[PDB]
């Protein structure tokens, strides 16, 4: 992120199209509030729930929420695997909302 900001900052200093030099990011979505909001907004395409969220109330409603909203969801093993995907120690839930055409 720092490199991209530096590169685009040099682009602005050289007075070129900074808004079009970059491309829309394609990445997994994370964060409990962010993922829950995406599921309610029907933007989530796939939901992966950590199996051992220590306060279980944080995810206990998610299977019922995903079922009502018609969002495909899975309970995957361990919080740390989801964390290492998003470069964290922990991730309660991950969400896939958009992918590339080869991965459709």
């Amino acid at each position: 992120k720092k490199q991209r900001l530096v590169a685009e900052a040099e682009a602005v200093a050289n007075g070129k199209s900074a808004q079009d030099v970059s491309k829309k990011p394609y990445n997994v979505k994370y964060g409990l509030n962010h993922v829950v909001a995406l599921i309610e907004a029907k933007k989530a395409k796939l939901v992966l729930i950590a199996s051992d969220v220590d306060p279980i109330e944080l995810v206990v409603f998610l299977p019922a929420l995903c079922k009502k909203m018609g969002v495909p969801y899975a309970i995957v093993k361990n919080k740390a695997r989801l964390g290492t995907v998003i470069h964290q120690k922990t991730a309660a839930v991950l969400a896939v909302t958009e992918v590339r055409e080869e991965d459709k």
Binding site: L5, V6, E8, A9, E10, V12, A13, A18, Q19, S22
Partner: peptide, 17 residues
Amino acid sequence: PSKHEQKRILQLAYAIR
């Protein structure tokens, strides 16, 4: 484009200058 990065872009451009 993301506005908060646009502010960050201006900050880094100022630092480089």
